């Protein structure tokens, strides 16, 4: 099962690579997300787990991108919107949590607690 082995390899690589700059983190998550989508399209039996992990990593990437926004570098009263992408980031991430919790068929308590 080279496909499944490779999927696990990529996921664990993402897990491991967390001690580095958010700039690098964003690119790593992007590479691996497009990787996972490609693999999900390529296979059919892994199409579930591949897309599930893909949406999860996308959720994490959205959170990181929101956190590294320029809004935090300006004082509170100077907030002026049109840059606070975190506003839409919150809605997108919440919707993705709903999507992952419900749409997929086989879900365990461990995964449910992760999602919550």
């Amino acid at each position: 099962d080279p496909s499944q082995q490779f999927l696990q390899q990529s996921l664990e690589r993402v897990y491991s690579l967390q001690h580095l700059d958010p700039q690098g983190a964003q690119e790593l998550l992007e590479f691996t997300i497009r990787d996972l989508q490609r693999l999900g399209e390529l296979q059919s039996e892994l199409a579930g787990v591949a897309d599930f992990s893909a949406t999860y990593l996308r959720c994490q990437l959205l959170l990181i991108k929101a956190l590294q926004e320029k809004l935090w570098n300006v004082a509170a009263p100077l907030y002026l919107k049109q840059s606070d992408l975190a506003s839409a980031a919150a809605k997108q991430i919440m919707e993705e949590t709903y999507k992952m919790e419900f749409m997929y068929s086989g879900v365990e308590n461990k995964q449910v607690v992760i999602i919550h």
Partner: protein, 88 residues
């Protein structure tokens, strides 16, 4: 970014006048946020961000000292205006 900066200056003067002259206790908001991180992309932006920080650190200190009668509040407003116009 330049246009956003001008809007920030305008909103700064508005916030200063509103939180210093009008009800200061109503505002009672602390500038408790990351400030002054050297991420600006131009010396012009850096200078403006410095001016903003100067104005905020003055106004936070001068929030409750005097009554709304605006004894020295006029001085703070005038100095903020001069600073804002200084950067051409």
């Amino acid at each position: 970014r330049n246009v956003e900066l001008q809007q920030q200056s305008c909103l700064l003067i508005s916030h200063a006048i509103e939180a210093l002259i009008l009800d200061p206790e109503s505002a009672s908001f602390q500038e408790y946020g990351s400030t002054g991180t050297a991420h600006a992309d131009s010396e012009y932006e850096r200078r403006m961000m410095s001016v903003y920080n100067h104005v905020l650190e003055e106004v936070e200190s001068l929030n409750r000292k005097y009554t709304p009668v605006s004894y020295m509040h006029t001085a703070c407003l005038c100095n903020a205006i001069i600073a804002l116009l200084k950067v051409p």
